[PDB]
Design a protein around this ligand. Sequence first.
Ligand SMILES: CCCC(=O)OC[C@H](COP(=O)(O)O[C@@H]1[C@H](O)[C@H](O)[C@@H](OP(=O)(O)O)[C@H](OP(=O)(O)O)[C@H]1O)OC(=O)CCC
Length: 104
Amino acid sequence: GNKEYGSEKKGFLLKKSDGIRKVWQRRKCAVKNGILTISHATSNRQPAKLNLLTCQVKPNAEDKKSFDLISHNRTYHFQAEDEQDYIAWISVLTNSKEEALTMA
Ligand SMILES: CCCC(=O)OC[C@H](COP(=O)(O)O[C@@H]1[C@H](O)[C@H](O)[C@@H](OP(=O)(O)O)[C@H](OP(=O)(O)O)[C@H]1O)OC(=O)CCC
């Protein structure tokens, strides 16, 4: 189950753009200390920090690779590399939030 994973992870996620062009774009992502850090395309720009206490993971109904991360002012649309990395990301995000709640 979720205990097959820890509460930290460094990797990449596909993040869907929006507007005239909606495409998947690879971004460096990391989870640590209850925070999801999402890098921008430009690598010297300060990354977005999402407090996982006030976010909700919504796995995809269908494809076992896509998931949303609902934050207070935005929904991020993510896609993992495959089934197994999807399970890893969602498990780590979950674990991180649970740990953060214990400590709050
Ligand atoms: C018009 C001139 C300005 C310009 O550069 O316009 C040309 C752009 C192509 O640019 P892009 O590289 O696709 O830009 C990305 C998207 O806006 C994406 O939605 C955004 O994520 P988010 O902000 O929604 O999450 C990314 O931010 P980070 O992920 O890095 O934060 C951002 O890098 O559009 C076109 O292809 C033209 C037709 C629309």
